[model samples]
Target chain A: MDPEVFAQARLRMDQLTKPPRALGYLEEVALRLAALQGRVKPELGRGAVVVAAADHGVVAEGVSAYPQEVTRQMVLNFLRGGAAINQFALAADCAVYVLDVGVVGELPDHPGLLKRKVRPGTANLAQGPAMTPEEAERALLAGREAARRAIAEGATLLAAGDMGIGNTTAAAALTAALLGLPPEAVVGGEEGLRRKRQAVARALARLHPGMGPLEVAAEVGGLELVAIAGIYLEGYEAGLPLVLDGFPVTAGALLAWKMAPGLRDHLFAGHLSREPGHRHQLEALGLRPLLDLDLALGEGTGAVLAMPLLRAAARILHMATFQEAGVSRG
Target chain B: MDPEVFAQARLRMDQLTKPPRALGYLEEVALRLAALQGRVKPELGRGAVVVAAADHGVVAEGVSAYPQEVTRQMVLNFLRGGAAINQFALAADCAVYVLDVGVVGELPDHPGLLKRKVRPGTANLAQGPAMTPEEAERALLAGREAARRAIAEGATLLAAGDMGIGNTTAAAALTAALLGLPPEAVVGGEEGLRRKRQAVARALARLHPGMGPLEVAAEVGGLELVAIAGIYLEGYEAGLPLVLDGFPVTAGALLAWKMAPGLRDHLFAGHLSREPGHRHQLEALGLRPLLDLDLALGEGTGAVLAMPLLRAAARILHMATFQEAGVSRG
Candidate 1:
């Protein structure tokens, strides 16, 4: 972020038609946006939510509540504009882009679908490495390329989302590895918790010494997770605000932040996810969520919901200053 | 609120494509909005922010940082689309209405301006009663009529904001009166607090037998505050969502809640105010704010900022449910 632009933005915000620092967090959001845009006044432009979809091999371990095929089904749902992310993004005046980073088999081509599949899927991580380090690189490349496509199509604001059956198991495993917490803390549920805990514990036991971002992500598996991380790395290059969705996507963010600590300046926690580890993840990132709706729906729903606020934050900069309005101060 | 409708809304929300209760606070917001709109699926159509501006002679007591005449100036700024509220409302896609409940002098009219002046500025509450019981009645009527006009003009969602120099002083006094708190607790500032504390203390000392809503508003004067209370009473009659802005506006809400407890069903806390008393007021009302941006510049700025959230909440209802989308749910 441009600190020079930030300084000027904060100055202009204080000069607006109210008490100094009266708009509070909004003033901060606008200033951060200004710094990102490299101007005293910023524009949020049109927002786009990028949902990277894939299948997870971990579903074979009975860890997922839904079937593995649900990933493809939901991805198709997203393409049809019949999903939660579609409803929310449309409501927020944002376009939706779905990336088939590594879903099983194949899907029909659609205008909304970005066909950038790295591979069919990953191997079962509970038994061994989910995917090779090279596969992780391919998935990351897919994420970056997908983001570039969205930006080229004219999206000024970007959000990264996730959708893959059994992905949360991988998320819980990856979070435990990256955040260095116990499986019990990251893995969700009772009966479901039993399977995920054992699976993540086994995955961690197979972990090599000093796992880097690639090692942790490849070891944990799930193509969409890696793709979200990919979105972050490239979104940093664009210097646009990257909105993050719920728990599983945030696990990918943890990986991205590990690869590039600079991602934090460009990232916005769209909302605090329902999963417990999401709280720890955000706290570690030094990021506060724009909303806390106890949301667990991970199709970029929360990101689109918070888009208007960023626009409103920038809109405030267009307001008349106290001097411009000629309203007596003090 | 229609508890039956709320139950149906929640039930339908859980049956949506995402996990049950996955939308979190937004789910709650939607459910509450559904109950208010008296349907399982609600619509937040055309939000309108009603800013009621008045004047306080308490500014003469030196308790305020800004001058009293700034009220008229800012009101004119609101009319000219040169104020913070106008900027925020335009950003949030809401119309802005300025009601002159009470100011030092008269002003020319405009299409957006609702000239419903009750009287000239109230007398110094530090010296005596802010207004007689009759003037308080007239101000409340003006507020009700302003709301009616806004609703008649196609505001499906209503928000009441305040603008009056030294109005926070009146708010502190009224809060201390109604909430049974001390001058130190509700009154803001250090040196500013000293004057307001003494002023509120003197005003409280002059209290006769136990004061009712009208008497309390009359004694602790400020026409905008009373008028906001009137907006609440009528908002309840319309059974529409009424959003509350900062400290002074919420002070009126507290008084209105006392007059008609049913108003709570129709109210939404737009944002938590920077004022200390706002949290206590919200707690007592069992209302949670939609946004908490530390805003203190009333004029319905916070309310406009939060309007988009309500619109999106309603938008979620138009989404495809699990059966509708035919996507597998665990």
Candidate 2:
């Protein structure tokens, strides 16, 4: 963190008309941005939501409410600009990019879609490792390249979103392994909980403690999770902030945080999902969500909905000057 | 609540280009607005923040961090448009009005200031009742009149804000009395909590159970609390949706809800405050705040910050149709 820039931002905020810290979290947001950007005035002028779509072999264990085919269809829906993420991104004035990281079938060429497929899908985690270590690294690289493209296209702020059936099971397994909690305590929904518990037990039985994030991710994480992890890691490397959507994205964020200490400084939890494991994951990451609306939908809708808040924070930091506003120091 | 209008609004939302309840709490906001306005397409086109500035005799007990003079100065700050609320209101595109409900000294005449002083300030609640019944009623009437004028000027959405030192003490007292909770549970901050506990215990010892809302206001509430209570009641009577500020405003909202049992339907909890009693007050009223940022600022900053969310909700309700957006109904 840039202490000089943060101090300057705090000084400016204290000089504003209201009492010191009267703006509360908004002021904190401004200070965080100032430290992140190493400037007193920082703006989240351009934004993008990177939605990574894939399939989960854990769907074979009946852990999800929807079929794996829904993942492919939702990616298509995103391309057609008819998904919830599209609507929310439109509202937040951010662009959406759909990344095909590991979908089960071939997708037609489209302007909004980026082909970054690592594999058709992973092996069922309930039986063995989800993917090879090399495959996890490849997926992570895909995410890194996608984020680089987004920044190259002028996106200063990026959001990580995921779409894959049975991904919640994969996320729960990763969260349990990372946090050292039982799977039943982290997973939600009665049927999903039972299936996730069995899958996580099977997956964890084969893994040992103190393993690195990449190896742990390969053991139980989905391709989309590895990709989302790459977005956070690469987003930090590029000094751009990333907004994390729901459980799967946050599960990936936890891995990124483990891979690089202080990576959380570049990430924001968009919202707490209805998934029970989400709170545990956020707690492990020491992050608070911007919104807490029982949201479980994971097409970057939560991230898009929260983008306006980031913009509002940036506007408050850049636009309001105490000298110009004629506010007295109280 | 108007069930017919709410039903129609729900039907319209379902026809929008998204899955049912995919918009989450935003859809709930739209439905509530529809019920309040009794229309399928309700618009929050015009908005205003009514800031009622007053002094609390409880400040004499050393319960607050600032002096009573800060109240008067903050009102001037609001008029100059230099406060945090002003910046937030500007961002939300809402006008602000500063009302001198009970400032200690005479305030200079300004076009933006509404002189509605009930008394110099309420009597010290630690020693006796804050105000007589007549003064309490008058303050309530002042708030009611302010809401009427705001509506007459085309403010369909009203936010009630208070500017008073030691006002949170009065709010804590009112909340404890209304909810039949001990003072220790609701108040925040060490000095404020100790002083408020003594004041509320003294005030409640003099009063009997089952006393009405107006009587409760007379017993321990500040002038601004009464006025804010009036705004809620009158805003509901006028069919104008009111956004509640932090603890004091919500304390007044509790009084209004008690006065009119169904008045909660026309109100929105703008944000949860850092005040410990705030969540209890909101829960007692069955209200869920639009934002929760640990804000304890009392200048309607939280309310103004949340106004854009309401506008966004209305936009989602009115802008997209399923047929036009080509959304599937799976």
Candidate 3:
């Protein structure tokens, strides 16, 4: 983010014909985007959310309401442009790229599907490590490569989306380990939450104190989670406006943050989710979400919903100044 | 709004391949648009906000930070497509209609300006009644006619915007009188609120007995306030998806509601404002603002900012459902 460009954007905003700071969060959005784009007048072209699909073996604990087969079903649904993210992406004028990183089932070949499976599925954290350290790095780099592929195709307003059942439990376990919070506080819901809590707690006891983010992710994070962190890593590397969806996606962001704490500055929390663990992740990173609609379905729907606001911000930046508008300031 | 169509929209939304209510307020938005458009799949076309500009005589009491001349200047800025609303409207693919309803000392003609001045400006609410009952009714009808003209010209998503120096003071007084709240509670700010509270208090004491909504509006409303109420009234009569802006515009909606309570069902609070009086008014009518960026720049900027949400809502309604997508819900 360019400090000079950000200051120029702020000057331009205050010079617009509204009260200073009257647009509130919008002003913050416009200026941040301008700084990220490294221009006083930033224009965010084409948006696309790379939704990485995988399977979490932790669903054995009855952590999720949906069956595991639904993961493959939904990825196919995404490819056919029939899911909620597809609808929102259409509305937001963004593209949906489905990455088959680690789904248990084999997905058939398609134009929208990016085949980058690093593992068939993650091992259950309650039982043992989700993957080896090498597997985790491979998944992270695959995510990095997927994001790199997206920018190569001209997607500036890039977002990281996730699609994996019981991934929230993995996110809960990951957030708990990263933030050093208790399992009950990180995992969401009652009997549903109780199952998630117990599973995460069992995983926490296995932590050997010197475990880094990659090791912890290897221990509990979903394949899509590390892939999303890879997406964040690439977003930082590319310096594009990086949007993050709910719990699982944000869990990935925590790993990316741990690796490169500077990535925190380039991140945008799309919205607050219904998951209890999401708030803890957002707070630990010192980030604020743009919207809060209690969204729990994480296929980048919340992320894309916020796309127009960023466009609105950029639009305001390129608008005429007060002098050009010939409006009174005094 | 059609109840049967609303039910159908809900059904369609749940059948879409994601968690039920996962889209959150967006679901509420889509369903409402469907109900208002009277279709299971609603489509909102060509959004337009009618921003009525007028001057408040209460500026004589020093209740505002900006001078009264800024109203006329800003209206011209709107005409030249340089105001914040114009820039936002550009991004939203919406048109901005500038209405010179009661701006003081305006001597210009342009295709962009809708010339329908009921008065040069509204009289002082602090002195006595802002305008006579006949004058208020004329301004109301003018707003009604303006909305009628827009609908005739192909605009479905209609919004009412306001621009009047010290009109927030007029709105403060109007809202306080309508809600039966104390002056201190209704008016915004401290030393600024001190002036507004005292002025509204003086006006409140002049009330005799059994004044109707129109009469109350005649006593304390700005020309644009009554005009905005007229906009709300027309929106209700048209049964279009009507959106209301911050404190002043909502004060008008309250007056419209006083006359016809059913209009409340058709209205969408565009966004919450920073004004203290805004929340009280929203609660009085049981309306939830789609956006809340703490915005107080009332050129319909916040109102139009939420326009894309409504369009996104409508777009999702027309997308593929679960049965069509061959996805499992159970």
Candidate 4:
């Protein structure tokens, strides 16, 4: 935010050993982070993507193709390492950890599950507020603790992904409130939802009478997304990289940045999801996604795929030298 | 070319990890080669792009934007390691060897120069034959020796590139004569020559009095490209992976494929150049290029950029397993 910081960031951007403007919008994010971190050649260390699974009570309105029970089932899928995000993370050479912040049913004992449930799930926000202020505070605390654990575990770069079937409805409500946009601009199809289901999702978003990002989170967002936002905020405070994946995660990034204006420099939108309001949320946050592959599945799959490209950029920044390759400077 | 070879090649195509058909026309070339080689999982190793530089005697007619003297100057640029190809080759980790198969001026001794001249330069083919049969034979021998040396120096994969001012006219003339196409279908702008130069190049193609590839080569093709064709033929005989770059190299690949049907198995078209008749040549040879950015630079830049993608394919093929990543077959 300081003028001197901006100038230093521009200097670091010029020092990167690539076509100054290539890699498109990612260059902007890297330069901003460099300035905020106040390092000429900032180092990006081992990155980790944590997928949080929670149920949304709004699924009781028949808002999703899958039943609310599937959320807990897929939480097991994440712990068992059989989901799309698992495979993608392996391909990216990054670690994936699962956090069961909240789901409808009691999750079974699992080796990889991080039992951090704030509440079983939130109430149906279309009908009533999803969580009380006290419950929201507790969820945020859980998220902060997750960040502490991640940092202690040696993760210098962190990403948060969420899984909850009817969660898109909740995400849309949050986006609409945060950007002061109508439901039409912030809701979309998910998990094979047809046109009719999408209309129902929009209706749900319009019905949620939330005020702003925080109010929207209390009114509709799942407990896990709030927890992830807390985690992202904590990571930002610690000067760690925070990668945001898809609709709910982007909303969390917006909430975190709004809570702490300086946190935007630590956040990266990992991808533009297939969800409708994802791009809008990214634009509102002034975030440029690392990739735009139309991937809508939100258990961190997009973030995992983008990990390879980011690692490549980091490696080139650290390794390439103009003098060694005999490249000329203008 | 044999029926058994064709069947086995089809099997190899079916066994590749990617979509059997979606790679577009390139799959066909790989399949044909698999059949000829009678093997699955064809090995790919160190690849080289050999560039041959020559001056055109017809440049005296002002057919190119730059003077004939520029050919020698650019070749020196290559020798001084300042060309685009130099950076691309370094990125691809491919060795680039430059040969002076035909140049009008004397080249000074340099570390990177391969002084293997086959006449000062070809006589203007628009006036008569470009080179005598004996001269063609000498050029072919130079190419053959280069390929042998490359193989000896640990190059198991090869691509040929060409650099000659006004040689586009010669390449177009050969394309028309050998493929039995009309001159207009094959002729286009020569180097930096614009609209009027295209007309001049077409007229030169029309003046060529030859039929079939060999006669066309003897009539108008540069000594360097023909010699490259000769090296490609030997590479095919030795079962090395052979990729072709741009229009002139595609012309060389066509002649080599025609000379030995088995050589088609070793051929890989890296990309389609912006030059006229390149697509037709690839189609006629039943070849599919791996990348198509409409590159027309004759220094093998396309081949070098595409190498990273090729290496990615190879890495995926070698490193990924269904069980390790928990990915399932469709």
Candidate 5:
């Protein structure tokens, strides 16, 4: 964040027809955009959501409501433009890309599908490590490449979404491990709490109590989680703001933040998820969610829902002027 | 709300591509619109905001940071289309109308200004009743007339906003009186709370321990508050969905609710204000705000910011269908 650009944006906002700070969070959003772009006129027209899909080995613990096959099925659903993310992305005028970071089954080639599988699927963390450190590095690299691809294709703003059954369990485990909290404190939902608590506890106990970002990713984080972390890191590096989806995506962001504390400035919490751990994660990250809709569904729906607000913020900065609007500065 | 229409809307929502209840609050919004419209295809393209401006007698107690004249000045600002509400309304494609319900000074004629003054503002509530019962009734009628005018102009959706200095103190007094709460619980901001607390307490003590909605309005409410209540009642009668702004508007809605409990079905909380009393008001009304942006600015800015979300909800029902989107029923 550039202080000079932020100061300039605040000055412009104060002059825009209302009392100082009357726009509230909208003004903060516009100033953040200006600082990120380092310009008076920031553009948010081109947006994209990278739906990182994979299969979580933690499903073997019966943590999710659906079977692991649903992960691949949802990936196909994204390709066919029928998922919630697809509908919301269409409404928000953002492109949706389905990235197969690591799914158990093979996915057919499709125009919207970005095939970048690091491995078939992660190992069951309940029994052992979810992925080797080397595999985690590959997954991170794959996510970095996918973000670069979107930026090259003219995406100025990016969002991270996840589509893996039982991934929330992995997310909770990772969140607990990184934030140094108990599994029960972070896990939510009826089935997941009842079925996966013991497994998550075991995974946490097996791994070293204190671990770095890559070490945690290799221990309990799913492939898609690592991929989202990669996108957050690379999105900041590329000077593009990133919108984080619910629990799984935020868990990934926590890892990314551990790797690079500066990345926090470039991230936005799209919405608060119903998952109990999500609130704790967001509070730890010092981020305020744009919406609290009790939303638990993944697939980037929350992130897409927030796109219009971001666009509105930029539009306010670009369109409204004090002199032309005939507002008296009193 | 029509139960049959609500059931039909739920059926349609469940049949959408995503899993049941996957869209979260958006799904609830669609269902509510369907019930309010009594149709499967709800149209929300036409929207308008009725900004009822007034002057609070409580300003005599120095309860606000700005002077009473700021109210009239802001109304002129509204007429010039240079207010925060104007900017947000333009972004949401909603029309804004300023109504001079009760300003201390006279306002000039303007195309957007609706000359509907109930009186030259209310009497000082710190000293006595803000308005006579007859004046309160006249103010209510003024708001009712404003809603009808907007409806006649093809505004299917209406939002209620306020513009008055020291009006929040009156809102707090009304809320505390009506809801049987303490003054400290409902008030927010600096000078208002410090200067108005004793006056609010005195006003509450003067009012009968048990009073009806009209009596409360006559005793402690601003002209704009009663007018907003009238809009809520009349908006319901006309089958138009109404958006409620911050504390003052919700206080008005509470009055209307006391008069007619069914109006709650046709009302939506636009956004949560930083005022502590706002949460209590929304909870009592059983309404959840669409946005929680820590907004304290009055004049319909929050409601206008929410107009686009309402449009999207109606569009979700009108545009998307199960078969056309090629979503397979699972």
Candidate 6:
């Protein structure tokens, strides 16, 4: 948020070897980091995934077709290592560290699992705040620890993913809080929610009175995602690349960016989810979505798919030196 | 083009360990090759550029804004290796073999230049047949030699490109001839040529109404592109991957595929050019272009850009074994 950091980032961006603004919004993040760190040769190192497993009490309100138990089932899926996110990690050759933030089941002690349970599950946001301040702080600490683990693993890029039903509504509320926008603009059709379901969803968003950031954070932000904000903050401080996933995770990223605008330098919009408000969030961040696959599976699969693209970009940037290329005009 | 080859290619495609037809139209070419070569394990080798450079006597009619001298100058630019295509080859790490099938100017004996000059240049197609049958055959032979050279260099992927002033007019005429479509559907504006120039260009296409394949070759097709067609066919025969560039080159691929349908199995439509006939040509050959950049640059720049994407796709195909990742149907 500092004017000096912004000016520095802008200056670094102007120094990129390519045609001015050729990379589009990707320049914003890359340049900001270069300026903030006072190093033109900014590099994106190893990437890690913070898979936040949680259950939403709103699922009990018949908001979703799948049983709430599927939350824990999918968490086991992540642990058993047979999830879409797993394939992404394999493709990216990155690590996925799972956190049982609020899943409603006992998790086995797995080597890759991070036991960061804040509660069994949060109260349904359809009724009120998903978690108390204490719970939110606990989840945030868990996210910080996940970042630490990724740092230990030599990961300089960090992605925070969420696995929870009824999280989209929470994300919308969080966005409304952050931007002072109407919740209707932030709410969208959930994965299985149809046109009529979306209308009803919009109606629910209208019913809630929009509030300020902290109030909205208390009112709607899930424990796990709030913790993701903490992880993102840690990544920003550590000078790591942050890969922001779809709505819920992006909402978390947006919140973190607002808290510390310097974090924007570390963020990369992985892919645009088919979910509504994703574009709005990306636009708010002035970031370009790398991939535009019509995917909204919330376990960070879309973001993970994009890691290959980022990896390719990074590899190309690092390996293909300007000197060897014979392309310099000056 | 053969039924047996088609069936075997389909079988190999079905065995590629991914979702059947996951790669869209790209599957057909891969399938056809698998059939032709009778191999389940297809190899992706080095990529080569078949630059088909020629001169258009029609440039004498003022169809293009650039001087006809730019053609020879660009060829020298190509030989001096200062052109965009040269930079692309360097970036792609591919071999560049320039073929001077109908260049009007004298070419220097350079390491990269392939001197297969069919004539000083073809006769102005606006006046009559651009080249005789014997000349067309010679040009084709020159292209075939380029393919052989690529194979000798261990290239398993071929990028067929073209460079000639006023060649778009010739390319348009060839597209109409090959597809049996009307000229109105294929004719388009050139890089700088306006409405009146385009009208003049369309009128020029009318001069090439020869019926036979050889006549079509001599009347409408660029001498260099026809040769590139021979090169594409050779690549197919050699079981190498052919990345077909936009418009003129694609038209060559269509002619080659029609002449020898077995060659279709080896070709990939790198990207759809801005030319409308490009999609028509692709559809006619049942080829699905991977990238649609809407770029109409005569050189194979789009195709060169597509090399990275092809590399990425093949990287995924080859690197990830089914058992290694546990991608099972459980």
lDDT (C-alpha, whole model) for all candidates:
0.85, 0.81, 0.85, 0.65, 0.82, 0.67
lDDT of 6: 0.67
Give candidate 3's iRMS in Å, 1 decimal.
1.7
Give all candidate RMSDs, comma-separated: 2.3, 4.3, 1.9, 7.9, 4.2, 6.8
Candidate 3 Cα RMSD (Å): 1.9
Give per-residue lDDT, candidate 5, residue A61. Answer: 89
Show how many residue pairs clash in every candidate, following the order shown: 0, 0, 0, 1, 0, 7
Worst 10 residues of 3 chain B by lDDT: B321-330
User: What's the CA error at residue A227 for candidate 5, in Å?
Assistant: 2.4
Model 4, span B164-192: residue lDDT tens: 87777777766665677766677563443
Per-model TM-score versus the true fold? 0.94, 0.83, 0.96, 0.61, 0.85, 0.69
Give the C-alpha miss distance for residue A155 in model 4, angstroms. Answer: 2.8
Ranking by DockQ: 1, 3, 5, 2, 6, 4
Considering DockQ, which of the candidate structures 4 and 6 is the better prediction for this target? 6
Docking class of 2: incorrect
Best by TM-score: 3
Docking quality class, candidate 4: incorrect
Per-residue alpha-carbon lDDT of candidate 2 for residues A1-330, written as tens digits (9 for 90 to 100): 788998988887776555566666777777888888888877776689888888989889988656577788778777876666776676566888888889999999987788988899899999989999999999999988888788888888889899888898898888888778887877775775677799998888888867788999999889999999888888888998789889888888888888998888877778888777888887877777888766667877788777767766765664445466543333
Name every residue pair that clashes in candidate 6: A140-A227, B1-B261, B1-B262, B8-B35, B9-B31, B9-B35, B101-B118
TM-score of chain A of each: 0.96, 0.96, 0.97, 0.86, 0.95, 0.82
lDDT string, candidate 1, A1-330, tens digits: 888988887787878778887877777778888888898878877888889998878888999788787889888888877777887876688988899988997899898888988888778989988888988998999999888888888888899889998888899888888888888888765777888889999998987667687888898857899999988788878878888888888898889999998888888877888888888889888888887767788988888888888888777787777888887877
Better of 3 and 5 by lDDT: 3
Backbone clashes in model 2, listed as residue pairs: none
lDDT tens digits, residue span B213-291, model 3: 8899889889999888988788789888988888998998899999998988888887899988999999998878788
**Model 5 pairs in collision:** none
Question: Which is the better candidate, 5 or 6, if ranked by DockQ?
Answer: 5
Tens digit of lDDT per residue, candidate 5, span A1-330? 888998998788777655566666777888898899998767677788888888888888888657777788777767776666776776566788878889988988887778888888899989999999888998888888888887888888899899888898899888988888998888885765777778779888877645668988789889999988888888989998889899999998899999998999998888898888999999998888888777778788888778767766765676445575543344
